[PDB]
């Protein structure tokens, strides 16, 4: 659905900025590729172009904010959402033990270019840590990620 509040748009704009390194307002294969690799992925040039083509409404070879917004505004079916939420969990769960620790969260955010203090990360872990085991499992992950 697309009944996005200005607050949500601004939040997506900041997410867009993690990709748009030079801040020119467009995401190129180079930028998309850089982010994916810092996350442990290894895409080919063709795969990157194919990904951009999916949402390239104006055919200019790059992804601009309006296109990224429409990508994020799209609503998908349950069997798609569950799998995608699982794929997302796998990214943070570096050692793959089924849980997300403070170190792993900090690692993904640091590679993305965000500067987090030691306290900020631990504060985040405790907000999502429902069962109180110091870590974050899938259920707690889904709640924090999809919040708002």
């Amino acid at each position: 659905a697309d009944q996005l509040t200005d607050e949500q748009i601004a939040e997506f704009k900041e997410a867009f900025s993690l990709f748009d390194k030079d801040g020119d307002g467009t995401i190129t294969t180079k930028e998309l590729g850089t982010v994916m690799r810092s996350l442990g992925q290894n895409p080919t040039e063709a795969e990157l172009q194919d990904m951009i083509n999916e949402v390239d409404a104006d055919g200019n070879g790059t992804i601009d904010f309006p296109e990224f917004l429409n990508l994020m505004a799209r609503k998908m079916k349950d069997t798609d959402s569950e799998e995608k939420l699982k794929e997302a969990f796998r990214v943070f769960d570096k050692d793959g033990n089924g849980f997300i620790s403070a170190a792993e969260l900090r690692h993904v955010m640091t590679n993305l270019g965000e500067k987090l203090t030691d306290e900020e990360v631990d504060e985040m872990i405790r907000e999502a840590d429902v069962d109180g085991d110091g870590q974050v499992n899938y259920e707690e992950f889904v709640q924090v990620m999809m919040a708002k």
Partner: peptide
Amino acid sequence: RRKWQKTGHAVRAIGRLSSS
């Protein structure tokens, strides 16, 4: 504020672009 969510949006975008 909501840095975890912002970060999550980026990761989710990649998953949506990969289109399964």
